[PDB]
Amino acid sequence: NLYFQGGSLGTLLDYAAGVIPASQIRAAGAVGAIRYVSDRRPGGAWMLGKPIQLSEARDLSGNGLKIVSCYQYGKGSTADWLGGASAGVQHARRGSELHAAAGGPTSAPIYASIDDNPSYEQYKNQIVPYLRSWESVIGHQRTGVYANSKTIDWAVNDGLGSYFWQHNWGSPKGYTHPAAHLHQVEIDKRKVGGVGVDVNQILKPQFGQWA
């Protein structure tokens, strides 16, 4: 149960296991997708949904669906942010390249992923340099952050990131950070076109869509 904060402005799906036709996204009641501009990590060769390719972007856009870019390569003991400043330049450069190669415009942001529930120490020591490096590569105005509500608050206070996508791992129950553009409300509980999807709700009308 979410505290009321205004109601969803539409559903965006995210998925790593495969590519979903536009017609099936629409049929599922979604208005678009948040798609990976990242490679497949070790142990992730199954992730046929990484990265989004140009042919998919054209399908989605032609059907009037919204596209948002996000970036996540590693996870857990291989989380991207562990490497701080150097890792942020490496991942932002790669994300930038894959975004451009998918047809993504320079007017759209890329949501860098903090797929964790970090301590404030980890945040200051590792995540701050990581996100500052993202901003050095693509610019503040293009830097989005996928993170829990505590981490979004920290970033907002430090001036890091222009777009925020909240996850629930370490977020207070029912809470939606008021700076957030997008909220992941359900993970890996449903399939569309045979592909497992997470469900995200749009919180603000300008949320990083390509168009």
Q: Summarize as ranges the residues that interact with Na ion (CB under 5 A).
A: 5-7, 178, 203
Measured from the CB of residue 182, what is the shortest distance to Na ion in angstroms?
10
In the bound state with Na ion, the residue whose beta carbon lies nearer, of 38 and 209, is 209
Measured from the CB of residue 19, what is the shortest distance to Na ion in angstroms?
29
Q: Which of 196, 204, 195, 155 is nearest to 176 (CA)?
A: 204
In the bound state with Na ion, the residue whose beta carbon lies nearer, of 20 and 179, is 179
Cα gap 164→144, rounded to integer Å: 6
Cα gap 151→161, rounded to integer Å: 11
In the bound state with Na ion, the residue whose beta carbon lies nearer, of 18 and 178, is 178
In the bound state with Na ion, the residue whose beta carbon lies nearer, of 131 and 203, is 203
Cα gap 85→70, rounded to integer Å: 19
Measured from the CB of residue 143, what is the shortest distance to Na ion in angstroms?
20
Question: Which residue number is nearest to Na ion in terms of Cβ?
Answer: 6
Residue ranges in the chain assigned as alpha helix (H)? 22-27, 54-62, 84-101, 120-122, 128-138, 149-158
Measured from the CB of residue 174, what is the shortest distance to Na ion in angstroms?
13
Block residue for tokens 């036709």: 21
